[PDB]
Amino acid sequence: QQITLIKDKILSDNYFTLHNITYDLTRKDGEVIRHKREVYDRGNGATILLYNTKKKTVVLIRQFRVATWVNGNESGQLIESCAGLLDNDEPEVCIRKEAIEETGYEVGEVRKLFELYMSPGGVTELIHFFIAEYSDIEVLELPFSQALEMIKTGEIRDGKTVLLLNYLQTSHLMD
Amino acid sequence: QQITLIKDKILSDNYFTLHNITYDLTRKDGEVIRKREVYDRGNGATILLYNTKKKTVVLIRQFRVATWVNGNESGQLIESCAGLLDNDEPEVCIRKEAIEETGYEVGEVRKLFELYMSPGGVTELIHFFIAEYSDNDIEVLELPFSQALEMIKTGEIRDGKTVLLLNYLQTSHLMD
Ligand code: NA
Numbered sequence: 001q002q003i004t005l006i007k008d009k010i011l012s013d014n015y016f017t018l019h020n021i022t023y024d025l026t027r028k029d030g031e032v033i034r035h036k037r038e039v040y041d042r043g044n045g046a047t048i049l050l051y052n053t054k055k056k057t058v059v060l061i062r063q064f065r066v067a068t069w070v071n072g073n074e075s076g077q078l079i080e081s082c083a084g085l086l087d088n089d090e091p092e093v094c095i096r097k098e099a100i101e102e103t104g105y106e107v108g109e110v111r112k113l114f115e116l117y118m119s120p121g122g123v124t125e126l127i128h129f130f131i132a133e134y135s136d137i138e139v140l141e142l143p144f145s146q147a148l149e150m151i152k153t154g155e156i157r158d159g160k161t162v163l164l165l166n167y168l169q170t171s172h173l174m175d
Numbered sequence: 176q177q178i179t180l181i182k183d184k185i186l187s188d189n190y191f192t193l194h195n196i197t198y199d200l201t202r203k204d205g206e207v208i209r210k211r212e213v214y215d216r217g218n219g220a221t222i223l224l225y226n227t228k229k230k231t232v233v234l235i236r237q238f239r240v241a242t243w244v245n246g247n248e249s250g251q252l253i254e255s256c257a258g259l260l261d262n263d264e265p266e267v268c269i270r271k272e273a274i275e276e277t278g279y280e281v282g283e284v285r286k287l288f289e290l291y292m293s294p295g296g297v298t299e300l301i302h303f304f305i306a307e308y309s310d311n312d313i314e315v316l317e318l319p320f321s322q323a324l325e326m327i328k329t330g331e332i333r334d335g336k337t338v339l340l341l342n343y344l345q346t347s348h349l350m351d
Pocket residue numbers: 166167168170171342
């Protein structure tokens with residue numbers, strides 16, 4: 001219930017900011033218990049899945065991700081849905097803009113899905129999720145069903161990407 | 176194809192490790208292009224406990240500072256059961272987290288896949304699991320599966336791994 005901020009210690013502020021936050025929780029009859037956690041703030045982002053109900057395909061993005069490279073992704077290439085850190089603007093604008101610039105497709109009306117914390121134990125990151133129809137950074141158009149199999153094989157292994165493809169499966173918008 | 180690590184600068188070593196990594200990447204024709212923050216908090220695992228007979232799932236509600244400083248007013252977040260890997264196989268680890276967090280013991284565990292949650296600057300790889308359960312400052316939540324799906328729509332559940340497990344559970348037909 002009651003949370004009190006005790007200390008905000010900056011551990012690094014190179015570009016993003018890492019904090020050690022000292023804080024106090026009250027247990028029931030407080031019984032105030034002190035905790036101290038690292039918190040990483042890279043701001044919030046948005047992501048969008050592009051899909052074609054006609055030829056039954058989706059558009060996805062492949063690029064080198066260094067944080068995967070030093071942690072078991074041998075070549076470091078990661079297949080992901082289009083995405084980007086939010087700039088100083090409404091989320092709906094930034095994502096339209098990422099989609100054009102990363103994929104080269106012009107995108108119609110977007111649909112807002114939800115806003116999710118992707119890794120809330122130590123990162124603040126909130127992502128806004130969107131889907132839309134459509135008609136170096138490697139641009140992959142591939143059939144929906146191949147994308148879905150790629151999940152099962154481990155070839156797609158990006159949390160937000162799997163989440164989107166799964167959402168799209170259950171939407172039946174591809175049915 | 177060619178990747179060369181040029182410099183691993185440690186920006187923080189308080190507990191987890193924040194690196195600044197300078198790396199050369201080679202393109203198409205041998206154009207060598209040269210820096211990014213990489214945060215290493217180790218890997219984790221998560222699990223969705225479900226019960227096919229009562230059509231319920233178990234989740235967890237806890238305070239999360241990282242959300243508290245970023246629009247989760249009360250800091251409480253409803254998540255699937257989860258934890259950072261110890262030095263052992265993921266499945267062993269998650270069996271422990273599930274019992275130590277929920278009190279419901281589990282037999283079968285099914286591994287779904289391993290996903291990077293925030294790959295643009297976090298190395299974290301989460302190992303996903305489901306398992307059916309029974310009995311026979313962390314609040315354990317037993318809820319109707321359909322209630323849980325709704326809560327994604329209402330926004331009462333707003334956590335990446337939890338949504339992905341729930342949607343997964345829906346697609347599997349285990350709960351039809
Ligand atoms: Na859905």
